Amino acid sequence: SELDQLRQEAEQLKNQIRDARKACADATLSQITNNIDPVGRIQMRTRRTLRGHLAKIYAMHWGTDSRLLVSASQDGKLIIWDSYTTNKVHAIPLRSSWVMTCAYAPSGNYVACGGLDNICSIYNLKTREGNVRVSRELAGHTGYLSCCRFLDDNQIVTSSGDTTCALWDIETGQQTTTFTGHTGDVMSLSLAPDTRLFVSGACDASAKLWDVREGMCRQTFTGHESDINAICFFPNGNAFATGSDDATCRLFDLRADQELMTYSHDNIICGITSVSFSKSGRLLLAGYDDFNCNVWDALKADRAGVLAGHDNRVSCLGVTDDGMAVATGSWDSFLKIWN
Amino acid sequence: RASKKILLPEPSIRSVMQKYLEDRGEVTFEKIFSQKLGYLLFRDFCLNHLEEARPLVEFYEEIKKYEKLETEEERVARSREIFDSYIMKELLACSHPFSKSATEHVQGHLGKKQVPPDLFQPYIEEICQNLRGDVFQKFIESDKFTRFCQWKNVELNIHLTMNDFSVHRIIGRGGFGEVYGCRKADTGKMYAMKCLDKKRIKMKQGETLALNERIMLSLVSTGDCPFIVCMSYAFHTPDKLSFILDLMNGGDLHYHLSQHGVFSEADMRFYAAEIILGLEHMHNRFVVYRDLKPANILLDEHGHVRISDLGLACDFSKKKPHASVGTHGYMAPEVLQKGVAYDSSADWFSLGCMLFKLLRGHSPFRQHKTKDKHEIDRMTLTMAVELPDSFSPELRSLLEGLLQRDVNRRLGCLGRGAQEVKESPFFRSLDWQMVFLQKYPPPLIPPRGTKGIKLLDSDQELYRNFPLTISERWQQEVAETVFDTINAETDRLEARKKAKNKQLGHEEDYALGKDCIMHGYMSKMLTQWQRRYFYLFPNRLEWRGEGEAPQSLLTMEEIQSVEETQIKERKCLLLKIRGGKQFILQCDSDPELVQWKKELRDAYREAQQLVQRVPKMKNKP
Amino acid sequence: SIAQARKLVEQLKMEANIDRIKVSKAAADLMAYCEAHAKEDPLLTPVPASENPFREKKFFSAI
């Protein structure tokens, strides 16, 4: 009937998209980058070990000053650290034990977090009174909060196990825009530098590019064979990397609308938990379930080096805005700063 | 005087205890208000810490004084007194006026000068209605419910040994052991301790008799009967079983009959009356005594009496017994006949036989001081009782009634039980409430001045469920001895700790503002025990030492199971941990053990159920 | 399902309606970005230990 005809038009369009993409594939990034020198052995070392969480660390996020960072943990706390000294600036006991993600406002005035409470909770740091307290609880999602990122002090984007992402106005506490499209749980998100766009990764094995202003899926990227656990924009906004349970990372270009590279090794069979680029985009850093973080030459696909300091899953990572340092968080309860 | 002291646990025990009670449905107005210690804590709260409930409880206690007045002349006086004075506050209270229905009922009786003890019962019902809503909810939030939990935790953790009693001289001897007078060290209350030796019990094959008495004491010991030797505690050591019973110093009525010689009708009337009320108590709880005789009647120091040994007694509520049990000369026809089932009917025949012996010096079916048991049993079934000319017509009526061979003809068996006996012409002169209150003067004041072996697992398991404490007995003991002083001392200790924690600056509660399920003290462990304070959250169990935040934990993911286990003597929890590790916990009381076992099991099962459907949190292949 | 299939066709129509550049040009722009920002990347191009807060840097600011 009507359904049979629309199932047949869905493949026609999908095949048109395949062939359009295939028409652009005139060379590989690997071929284009064959002339440039390798990076050589990158040998980063643990310069700080941050102790305080009593249980698994699930997420972290650097502040824009490249000094303070927030971590979120199974112990039901956020800790805000001064990486230069190892001192704690704030320990924040949360209302819900089940936190999964956290974020640091670009201003450094607010942090956010959430999890199986299904709520993104905003905390004011330097209050008019004195102490740290909840300024807002953002309810709306039907499932767990998996990731969140501030655009400014009044605006934050969220992703959920309900399969949606959303943009919030923190004053009203309402969803300004909803982003429907994903088939399964949404695991990670990443804002573009300019903030007009963002990307999400999901358990449907796909990444979607979204228009913030308009509220629509512009492009969808496939290739991964399993859940996408992490995602990160390339510094210039024209590309992003993903990390998956299939044991590969992948680079995608927006304007070419396809995969450029795969970062893989036969010996690496465990899942990727987190991803981030170095400041220039040349290095792609990924955390793994085998307790290591691997450092990939983003242009050539060679493994450049390893961060091997944790005794359980590396659950999260981040590179500073100034590029001086990498932070890893782990199920062993510690964060390490490397360079 | 109490040599030992009871120590209440800290107010923090509430977190555990409230939940324990809540899961049993015991946190209700009816459940708490009807307990002695619950009542006392509730009235304290209302009289002293909540002005809106004060007059309700004041008026309640005034009505209870009126209920206890013996004569109608007094009830005429009070009923006026009460209705005239301080009813005026209740009528003027906007929140609490008594109903038209209630007042019209009370004024109806009063207007006709009718003043029964339950004259003000309608006002009780409306007071309880007004006490069981918001007032009760505020009581539950108060430190007086916290204090109830502290007391309740002590009650539910009683483990008695011989060291908990100050034992004195032997005051009675039996086949399987002996009775001592003793003082309970906690409270200073004097008691009788019946010690039955287990090696003797096994030797003479009296296991069932010892256990039955234990069961029968349980059924009978509620309601505070002044005329039965009731139990407050049962406990046992490796070699002995122990019953803690009402102390009766005055010797048994067989001994006194042997010293005094026969009694007059007027002296027998006194003993008969008190004994009847004892049997009534048993029969309302569906217990047939079966061995009623002078030697099983004990005298206290003032000469008042109780019924003693319940080892041959029987619960007839579900199945009626038919076996020939009791003493020859006192057994009914329906008892002597094998195959014939009998109820409480047996005790009324026994009574008739005993009352006769008090007057004459022998059972009516014991002729010529004979020792032939076959003769005695046979006279019972066929011999008509030749009552002497000496006896009054009222007595003759009573004994003819009680000693009817046919149950359908017999007094106390025609439908209404003890009431049929109470209204027999012999007892016409007695006010039966005065009998109950032990107000009639006793006719006799007592003068003031081999080889056993092999106790195994098989035998000890017979007495697995021997230990018992009867709640109302314990609470009554506590209330009338040490309750007042220990409450005041604990108030002082808590105030000191409160004021000290203000001085130190550690005046913040880690359990608040989060999702803490429950918290309290437990002990963790290679040789020695480390006592620490634990907080249970939905994804983890944390703990701290004194003067610090928690710095260690277990997650609910790690826990594979939660099981009980004995280390040495005391029970403990065994947490089996992921990757073949273990964690042993020891609790400070039995309720705490039960609750921690339950809440941990619930918390780990629910957590592992949540995690499995969250990809970021779960274990990946 | 009728509604859900109609959303998809509309959505795929939008995805197909984009214009696309060559992978060779796209890849060339990424390579050029990296090369233009390599000197400013402290993980690629180490700084002296004296300007690195996690090695040997002497002075710091408040927070």
Ligand SMILES: O=C(NCCc1ccc(Cl)cc1)c1cc2c(Cl)cncc2s1
């Ligand atoms: O059960 C009692 N008498 C029955 C006979 C008896 C005596 C000792 C044992 Cl070992 C067994 C049986 C009782 C005696 C007392 C006392 Cl002399 C004092 N107070 C209470 C009670 S109850």
Ligand SMILES: [Cl-]
């Ligand atoms: Cl002893």
Ligand SMILES: [Cl-]
């Ligand atoms: Cl008395």
